[PDB]
Design an enzyme around this catalytic site. Structure first.
Site, PDB file in Angstrom:
ATOM      1  N   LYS A  92      14.321 -25.515  -1.995  1.00 38.82           N
ATOM      2  CA  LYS A  92      14.286 -27.701  -1.187  1.00 38.82           C
ATOM      3  C   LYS A  92      14.868 -27.932  -2.028  1.00 38.82           C
ATOM      4  CE  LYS A  92      10.309 -27.054  -3.431  1.00 38.82           C
ATOM      5  NZ  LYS A  92      10.171 -25.644  -3.768  1.00 38.82           N
ATOM      6  N   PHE A 101      20.793 -19.249 -11.158  1.00 42.04           N
ATOM      7  CA  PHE A 101      20.970 -18.418 -11.557  1.00 42.04           C
ATOM      8  C   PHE A 101      19.197 -17.524 -13.110  1.00 42.04           C
ATOM      9  CE2 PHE A 101      21.446 -18.519 -17.113  1.00 42.04           C
ATOM     10  CZ  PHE A 101      21.703 -16.982 -17.640  1.00 42.04           C
ATOM     11  N   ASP A 124      14.773 -13.620 -14.165  1.00 37.14           N
ATOM     12  CA  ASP A 124      13.617 -13.560 -13.858  1.00 37.14           C
ATOM     13  C   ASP A 124      12.910 -13.203 -13.078  1.00 37.14           C
ATOM     14  OD1 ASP A 124      13.621 -15.987 -15.705  1.00 37.14           O
ATOM     15  OD2 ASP A 124      13.155 -17.553 -14.854  1.00 37.14           O
ATOM     16  N   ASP A 126       9.926 -10.158 -14.522  1.00 34.16           N
ATOM     17  CA  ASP A 126       8.998 -10.297 -14.413  1.00 34.16           C
ATOM     18  C   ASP A 126       8.615  -8.520 -13.109  1.00 34.16           C
ATOM     19  OD1 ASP A 126       9.109 -11.191 -12.073  1.00 34.16           O
ATOM     20  OD2 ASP A 126       8.343 -13.165 -13.588  1.00 34.16           O
ATOM     21  N   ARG A 178      11.405 -13.714  -3.070  1.00 34.16           N
ATOM     22  CA  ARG A 178      10.636 -15.259  -3.911  1.00 34.16           C
ATOM     23  C   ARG A 178      11.652 -16.134  -2.575  1.00 34.16           C
ATOM     24  NH1 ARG A 178      11.605 -18.355  -7.649  1.00 34.16           N
ATOM     25  NH2 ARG A 178      11.844 -16.884  -8.805  1.00 34.16           N
ATOM     26  N   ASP A 217       6.949 -17.755 -23.293  1.00 30.95           N
ATOM     27  CA  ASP A 217       6.095 -17.317 -22.533  1.00 30.95           C
ATOM     28  C   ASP A 217       6.446 -15.561 -22.109  1.00 30.95           C
ATOM     29  OD1 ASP A 217       5.152 -17.742 -19.762  1.00 30.95           O
ATOM     30  OD2 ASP A 217       6.447 -17.243 -18.337  1.00 30.95           O
ATOM     31  N   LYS A 275      10.609 -24.171 -20.978  1.00 28.02           N
ATOM     32  CA  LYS A 275      10.757 -23.581 -20.155  1.00 28.02           C
ATOM     33  C   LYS A 275      10.865 -24.118 -18.421  1.00 28.02           C
ATOM     34  CE  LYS A 275       8.958 -19.820 -17.291  1.00 28.02           C
ATOM     35  NZ  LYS A 275       7.990 -18.539 -16.446  1.00 28.02           N
ATOM     36  N   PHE A 279       3.659 -31.898 -13.098  1.00 22.91           N
ATOM     37  CA  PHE A 279       4.165 -30.374 -12.088  1.00 22.91           C
ATOM     38  C   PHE A 279       3.936 -29.493 -12.800  1.00 22.91           C
ATOM     39  CE2 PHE A 279       6.967 -27.053 -11.503  1.00 22.91           C
ATOM     40  CZ  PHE A 279       7.028 -27.079 -10.075  1.00 22.91           C
ATOM     41  N   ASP A 283       0.814 -27.649 -10.399  1.00 21.34           N
ATOM     42  CA  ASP A 283       1.469 -26.571  -9.233  1.00 21.34           C
ATOM     43  C   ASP A 283       0.342 -24.954  -9.719  1.00 21.34           C
ATOM     44  OD1 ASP A 283       3.822 -25.092  -7.745  1.00 21.34           O
ATOM     45  OD2 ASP A 283       4.188 -23.964  -9.608  1.00 21.34           O
ATOM     46  N   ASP A 284       0.254 -24.882 -11.453  1.00 19.43           N
ATOM     47  CA  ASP A 284      -0.842 -24.002 -10.974  1.00 19.43           C
ATOM     48  C   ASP A 284      -2.503 -24.402 -10.576  1.00 19.43           C
ATOM     49  OD1 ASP A 284       1.097 -22.799 -13.276  1.00 19.43           O
ATOM     50  OD2 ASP A 284      -0.022 -23.679 -15.167  1.00 19.43           O
TER      51      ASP A 284
END
Ligand SMILES: Cc1c(CC(=O)O)sc2ccc(Cl)cc12
Ligand SMILES: Cc1c(CC(=O)O)sc2ccc(Cl)cc12
Ligand SMILES: Cc1c(CC(=O)O)sc2ccc(Cl)cc12
Ligand SMILES: Cc1c(CC(=O)O)sc2ccc(Cl)cc12
Lengths: 343, 343
Positions: free
Chosen positions: B50, B91, B96, B100, B105, B167, B193, B232, B236-237
């Site tokens: 975005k 990056f 990431d 994980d 993505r 994290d 993070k 934010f 988001d969660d």
């Protein structure tokens, strides 16, 4: 040796580096656990090597700066910048071992192969890189060469990463295509992936700390240093196979790893349609019998003699380069490196 | 919207960025193949999002700098620095996704999952990071805020990497220990993070380009921005589970991924010995039946109401922070961000 005596004060300063890098937790206990992880990453990956790159910064610094200008703080900074070079090295190794699925490094288990680490080592590798800039700010923020060192280190990373890209594109893990193992590609890989950060960076750093920031002076030092780097890797490839593990301190595996070695590059230029087939059918194989078949072909093509002839020409050329581009720097700066590298 | 109209000139400038970054091959055809790989890495990972972070640099720049000082070159630099923020983002995402083991993505296949990429994406991720500094040098070398931007970007990487470490240490892939999912740990993770590089960095960059380098001005902007970042992530969660995929544009999986979500953190503070067990036996499971069991517990604990109550308090606090720390900056700078984030 200039490195042997200085090595003591070098490895001893690491304790201070760790302290400083893990002391920003005193004001931010919230990241305490992360800082503890950082310490562990530092002690495991920045220690255990020979420190040739870092020590070079210290040795060169003492030869480019007047004996009286070498106060406690100036030397402190030299040791720090030397340790920055080693962290850059640690950053590359941790990442590289992951990308090529290595098992061990410097005799010990590769960091990412350690229980509970795995792919998290990718973030650990990036932290090592980040520490470089934290150290530069903490020790050289007020120096006139500050920005010069930041850019030199950023440039060395870019150059090395471009070189790694080239190396990955040249020997894809799943394509034993010896067609791309050319001499031009080999020299380009060595130059970007190894020569720039291993030989130019250390000397260039000391130069800036000494006040030598001339674009022409750096250009001349690079001319010499990149040639030394080229000879370094070529000799390293040769010793990987024909070297003695008892002396070198490592067992060669370039043949089993399908590496784009100087040896295979030469073997490809000096091979008949039939000799090439043997190579194309025994390179990158774990079978000890197939590996020995490659070594046989090499000797059959008198590569050890080719290397000797190359070492002689390289030595002559380097001495000529030093005689022509050393000034205004002390020739001993480059001569000392040559003596360390050549036998 | 200030972002909608500007987004056009933003995404259009990417073509120039690629050109400039892949034009150092004109003088060094030897690395040509590497440069071509770099181009592919750039087009695949820096495009498709975005661009909220990058555009923020452009929008803020136009509000902090006088309309007449916004010449062609100044705006060109603003777009470039905005694209630097996006490369930093690229990056982090590439790295990431690897760490994980993500599959997709932005809807598409994660770069490392693409045929022929794999772990080589670790070097690609580092190249993206390196491009940031190449762009800064190529476009801002002569500007008085040059060093300020370099350090801001280096600092943002360090902060984000420390946050990623935290994290990783908090939710180890193989340890469903909800004991470490505390509120303090959650807030620390979000801050390092995500908040620093997602909200502070973009505004801080524009500030320096505008001539605002005051340590106090940056400290006040950070106070506001880090709070917005905290809200934010929390929102988001919340939306990850209770949000509508049709609107949000994504399907939640924090529960199946055993993520340290704000929801689970709250659920852990508002749970009885029996409720906790249900959570400890249904969190991090792929079973759709177990996941729904977690969502049920959340609603049972009236978390959606807790979030609403938190959104209201957060909004009030942010407006208070803006009223107190905005000056000498235009309040519209922060108000515009708030309006974008809050609903
Ligand atoms: C480096 C070098 C010399 C200089 C020295 O005496 O150390 S003489 C010589 C002969 C053969 C080879 Cl292969 C190398 C050298
Ligand atoms: C042998 C060697 C290197 C290879 C390594 O130690 O990994 S980098 C470097 C820099 C300067 C000098 Cl003098 C030697 C070396
Ligand atoms: C952000 C916000 C308001 C400001 C606005 O009008 O956009 S009124 C209101 C009520 C409830 C919640 Cl949850 C948020 C808000
Ligand atoms: C929604 C959002 C972010 C999350 C993302 O787009 O990935 S970073 C950011 C920065 C500024 C503004 Cl105004 C919004 C956002």
């Amino acid at each position: 040796d200039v490195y042997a005596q200085e090595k003591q004060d070098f490895v001893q300063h690491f304790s201070q580096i760790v302290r400083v890098l893990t002391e920003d937790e005193m004001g931010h206990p919230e990241i305490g656990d992360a800082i503890a992880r950082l310490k562990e990453v530092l002690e495991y990956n920045a220690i255990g090597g020979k420190y040739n790159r870092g020590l070079t910064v210290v040795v060169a610094f003492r030869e480019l700066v007047e004996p009286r200008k070498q106060d406690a703080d100036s030397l402190q900074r030299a040791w720090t910048v030397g340790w920055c070079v080693e962290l850059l090295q640690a950053f590359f190794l941790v990442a590289d071992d992951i990308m090529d699925s290595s098992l061990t490094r410097r005799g010990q288990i590769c960091w990412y192969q350690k229980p509970g680490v795995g792919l998290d080592a990718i973030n650990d590798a990036n932290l090592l890189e980040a520490c470089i800039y934290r150290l530069l700010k903490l020790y050289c923020r007020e120096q006139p060469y500050y920005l010069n060192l930041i850019e030199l280190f950023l440039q060395s990373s870019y150059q090395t990463e471009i070189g790694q890209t080239l190396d990955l594109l040249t020997a894809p893990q799943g394509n034993v295509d010896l067609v791309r193992f050319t001499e031009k590609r080999y020299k380009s890989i060595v130059k970007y992936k190894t020569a720039f950060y291993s030989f130019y960076l250390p000397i260039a750093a000391a130069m800036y700390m000494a006040g030598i920031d001339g674009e022409k002076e750096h250009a001349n030092a690079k001319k010499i240093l990149l040639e030394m780097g080229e000879f370094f890797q070529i000799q390293d490839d040769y010793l990987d196979l024909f070297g003695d593990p008892s002396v070198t301190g490592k067992i060669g595996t370039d043949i089993q790893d399908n590496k784009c070695s100087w040896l295979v590059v030469q073997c490809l230029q000096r091979a008949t349609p039939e000799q090439y087939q043997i190579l194309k059918e025994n390179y990158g194989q774990k079978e000890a019998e197939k590996v020995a078949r490659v070594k046989a072909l090499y000797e059959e093509l008198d590569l050890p003699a080719v290397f000797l002839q190359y070492e002689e020409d390289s030595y002559s050329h380097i001495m000529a380069l030093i005689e022509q581009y050393a000034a205004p720097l002390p020739p001993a700066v480059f001569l000392g490196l040559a003596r360390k590298i050549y036998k």
